[PDB]
């Protein structure tokens, strides 16, 4: 009824909308890297260059 914007629908076949199975869960895959990048030695350096 909402698609036709009418309270009465004549006999027939109407295409209303679409369907799509929603995702079940979420996964994320990254390489087995554990070393943390040397942000400390670059940022926390006592003296910087010119």
Closest contact distance (angstroms) between CB of 48 and other proteins is 8
Determine if 49 is a binding residue for other proteins (CB under 8 A).
yes
Determine if 47 is a binding residue for other proteins (CB under 8 A).
yes
Determine if 35 is a binding residue for other proteins (CB under 8 A).
no
The C-alpha atoms of residue 13 and residue 23 are separated, in whole angstroms, by: 30
Task: Compute the CA torsion angle 39, 41, 46, 50 (nearest 10 deg).
Answer: -70
Minimum CB distance to other proteins smaller for 22 or for 50: 50
Tokens 């629908």 belong to: 9
Residues that bind other proteins (CB under 8 A): 45-50
């Amino acid at each position: 009824k909402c698609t036709l914007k009418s309270f009465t629908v004549e006999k027939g076949i109407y295409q209303t909308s679409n369907f799509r199975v929603q995702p079940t869960e979420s996964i994320v895959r990254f390489p087995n890297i554990t070393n943390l990048c040397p942000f400390d030695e670059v940022f926390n350096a006592t003296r910087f260059a010119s």
